[PDB]
Amino acid sequence: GGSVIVIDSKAAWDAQLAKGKEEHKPIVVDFTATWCGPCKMIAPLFETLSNDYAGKVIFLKVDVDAVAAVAEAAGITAMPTFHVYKDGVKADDLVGASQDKLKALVAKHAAA
Numbered sequence: 106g107g108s109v110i111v112i113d114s115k116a117a118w119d120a121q122l123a124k125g126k127e128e129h130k131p132i133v134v135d136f137t138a139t140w141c142g143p144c145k146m147i148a149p150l151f152e153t154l155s156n157d158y159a160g161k162v163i164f165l166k167v168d169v170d171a172v173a174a175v176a177e178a179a180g181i182t183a184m185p186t187f188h189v190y191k192d193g194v195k196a197d198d199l200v201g202a203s204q205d206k207l208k209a210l211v212a213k214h215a216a217a
Contacts, residue, residue, distance in 0.1 A: 107152035132190040143202035
């Protein structure tokens with residue numbers, strides 16, 4: 106929902122990472138699963154933040170069931186896991202469903 110872009114393939118993943126690098130905009134990614142309780146608790150905030158920061162931060166969703174190869178390359182072991190990507194590469198991460206920590210992560214990387 107919101108301004109979150111759902112990733113459906115490795116090809117789409119690569120293309121979004123490439124666009125964030127060209128646009129010089131940070132990317133925040135939610136690695137998630139619909140069987141995971143904490144994922145369901147935090148997804149509304151991820152969506153709201155995607156609206157609030159639309160234009161400053163790009164928001165992607167990777168369902169680990171839908172794109173296991175992208176989940177594997179990201180080294181995920183618990184969910185939700187949030188990654189920040191800048192200039193094509195992982196810059197930061199945050200594991201778990203803390204609302205304050207997710208807000209702080211987006212603000213940190215949106216201030217540039």
